[PDB]
Structure 1
């Protein structure tokens, strides 16, 4: 039996009781009428929503294996064709994921640590910021390049020069699909597959954007094979190629070319625009909160100095900086509804039964914005992650990366990118606004699955 919920009108479902824009405000309202777990209908498709720490925890952690599905829609299945990590399921998923996770360990790619790659990029990021000569600017693009190049460095064993035309079309391609797939219209075309017919241009752009990206990665994969020194791998590409080698027999093992390309594109789709939006939302909060930025700057000076680049080891000695990054991700609420999951078999959830393959929506926003764990959860305040002695206070409610079996495969890489970029940036500049701070609003715009920070101009003042 499915959990209770609003009464569905026949073919459209609950689609009229939901605010397609702030779709998370609607769910929150239902929880007030139907409790922790409830069910809504997107057309003829059922979606069971889990709202609250208890529910979210129970579902993703405790009954994890059953909820370690993943959500797939008409569109995404068409794009990825079931390959990779994000979209794949079952034996394909576990097989790929595990390899990816080990390869994505700081020293899981060879002699050159992932950290070293980020650091190089942190320096490069800083240099481009110098070139703005302290003039006002929109950090969207520049900040965007850093993360995307990180994945590039991690996937192709060499960063791109911010001006390489190959780096730019590739990056603007991922930024396009992201932008499109983050449109509320995809949330209506997935539940009504006929509407795809009304967007031939958009539809065409996405398919052409996917074709050229895959097609590019293929060539890129081949030029790594013809220079493959199996003794010591260079990057994620070599590592996967070596794995494919010992599958000479297997011929079902998911370690083939078709999965390689797909898994790579997944590192780009999941690890680029996400970090980008957070560094973006991060600077904006640091800009709006000078006192906070000072203290971070005060810790950087003490623990790191004004000469060496910041590294991950400094984090354990910079409690306040840790809490700023944490509070950045929390406030940020990047993915409010989390990514859609699905149950592996018919599952029982406290008095209810969810048939194998039902769409699962764990509400991350509800955990992160918990009234008691973080008093006054709507205001930015690093104190949510600090104890009365200024020490870092870890939270079980810290779920910006989701929880359970399907937790972000790049959690390490993401937190690394956020800490290193932001600290290095603050180490070299001060943040001046193109107006008063009181004229600066940090309220997000959630016109989609990924909430975005508002457009803003910032001045990087080195001192």
Structure 2
């Protein structure tokens, strides 16, 4: 009959005065205590329905896909993306851009696996050259994941010591942080007001323009050398489609979709997997007995030299459990990416009007103590049975579900496994901080959950 229950709002401020100072997620976990798994919070001027736990989330994204499949905005980046590109598009643009992006990622020329394998070898050579010196591995982790996207999109990889590559990686890093910051969460509530003032939203806008400028230039160099009978990469393929549909003024294959879809694939392609890697190696420093056990399995299944391959996974249940647990623990996007309802819909008795924003709080499925005993601790046994065999679970939804499910899922799982195991096959880790002193508390927790900076050494075996 009405919207899910929640804290009683004030006219201008919504539920501001009921929020927790520590962020949106914390705010929402407190409301969930009081209201249950389906509730409404007024984020500044508008109601947003929160869905918590695997059942409710899957009931919405899978059983009710006809309605929960729209994409909402992220205040901090809407001014840039404006509903262009696969992540932020709706309706028929999304359908075109999704089919195109899914279809030209898989089809191309090396397999996905081969490209990751080569990149893993370049990574190992790089880590060798560093001769056990301390670094903050953020740049390398962004470099190897960026290079996978790059070879699909630009037809090329960049070298780790290229200062122009590094400068773009810095912008991806700064932006993800700024977006996930306390100001970014405030902005989600009050963009309407805050936009008129200086603040992080302008820096994010400017960073994204700067990345936009490289992509515009690359599109140009491609157009100039384009061979219709032999498209090199995803940009070439988009250009061909642009040609084919030029007589339709309403073609989705526009120039803004070109730039912003590409940029969307890049952002998501780089920052998601690299952040998981960052948390992953920090977790390894804090739990060296886990890293040592992963290494014993690599030794026994793969050996000290033969490059790891995807077909190794099924024979490495421990390593897979550690990687699942890294993802579960990391909780990359704790509230997922905003959805909206596309038509009036009933959900557990409530009525959700059309164009009502919905957050699926993926963090609540990942921390569900019915599936994961002691869900706030890192523990790979979360994903092992009695016999040490891999135990997958329905609650494991860090890619979300349904029509909008991460389209990069397969690529990211390939990268996490090949980069994790290839590094561990060749190196052990050390740092100047004892495992008991290692603090896992995120540096940011908003849209994204971002681990603190740290120094690590990679020691050759």
Structures share fold, TM-score greater than 0.5: yes
CA RMSD of aligned residues (A): 1.8
Partner of 2:101: 100
Equivalent residue, structure 2, for 1:294: 292
Change (3 A) 1:206 1:433: closer
Distance 2:182 2:442 in 1: 16
The whole-number CA distance in structure 1 between the counterparts of 2:294 and 2:385 is 17
Check the 8 A contact 2:285/2:430 in 1, yes or no.
yes
- In the alignment, the residues of structure 2 paired with residue 238 and residue 390 of structure 1 have an alpha-carbon distance, to the nearest angstrom, of 47
Question: Residue 445 of structure 1: CA displacement?
Answer: 4.3
Deviations 1:143-166 (A, max 9, x none): 222212222222111101122233
Q: Is the 8 A contact 1:21 1:448 kept in 2?
A: no
1:328 aligns with 326
Residue 197 (str. 1) matches residue 196 (str. 2): yes
Q: Which of these residues, 155, 161, 183, is aligned with residue 159 of structure 2?
A: 161
Q: Secondary structure at the match of 2:34?
A: helix
Q: Distance in 2 between matches of 1:255 and 1:238?
A: 12
Hey, what's the Cα distance between the residues in 2 that align with 1:65 and 1:56? 14
Query: 1:385 is matched with which residue?
Result: 383
SS of 2:114 mapped into structure 1: helix
Instruction: Report 1:5-84 matches (<5 A).
Output: 5-84=6-85
Q: How many residues align?
A: 459
1:70/1:340 contact within 8 Å kept: yes
1:396 and 1:316 map into 2 onto residues whose CA distance is: 19
Give SS of 1:266's match: helix
Deviations 1:158-209 (A, max 9, x none): 1011222331222222223222222221232343222122216x44433332
Is the contact between residue 125 and residue 143 of structure 1 (CA under 8 Å) also seen in structure 2? no
Equivalent-residue separation in structure 1 for 2:455 and 2:169 (angstroms)? 22
Instruction: Provide structure 1 residue ranges, at least 5 long, that are not aligned to the other structure.
Output: none
Select the residue among 314, 317, 325 that pairs with 2:315: 317
Alignment partners' CA distance in 2, 1:386 and 1:41: 40
1:425 matched residue in structure 2: 423
Distance in 2 separating the partners of 1:38 and 1:414: 32
Provide the C-alpha distance between the structure 1 equivalents of 2:161 and 2:419, rounded to a whole number of angstroms: 20
Once the 2 structures are TM-superposed, how far is the Cα of residue 328 of structure 1 from its aligned partner? 0.6
**Cα-to-partner distance string for 1:356-400 (whole Å, 9 max, x where unaligned):** 111101111110111111111111111111122222111111111
TM-score, length-normalised on structure 2? 0.95
Residue 179 (structure 1) aligns with: 177
Distance 1:40 1:312, change over 3 A: same
Greater shift, 116-125 or 67-76, is seen at 67-76
* 1:446 to partner: Cα distance: 4.4
Superposition TM-score, scaled by structure 1 size? 0.94
* 1:436 positional shift: 2.2
Aligned match for 1:139, one of 115, 137, 140: 137
- Preserved contact between residue 5 and residue 39 of structure 2 (Cα < 8 Å): yes
Alignment match, 1:224: 222
Distance (whole Å) between structure 1 residues aligned to residue 186 and residue 433 of structure 2: 39
Deviations 1:40-99 (A, max 9, x none): 111121011011222111111111231111111554332012210111111000110111
Unaligned runs of 5+ in 2: none
User: How many angstroms apart in 1 are the aligned matches of 2:213 and 2:142?
Assistant: 23
Q: 2:363 pairs with 353, 362, 365, which one? A: 365
Are the equivalent residues in 2 in contact too, given 1:117–1:154 (CA < 8 A)? no
Cα pair distance change 1:316/1:253, threshold 3 Å:
farther
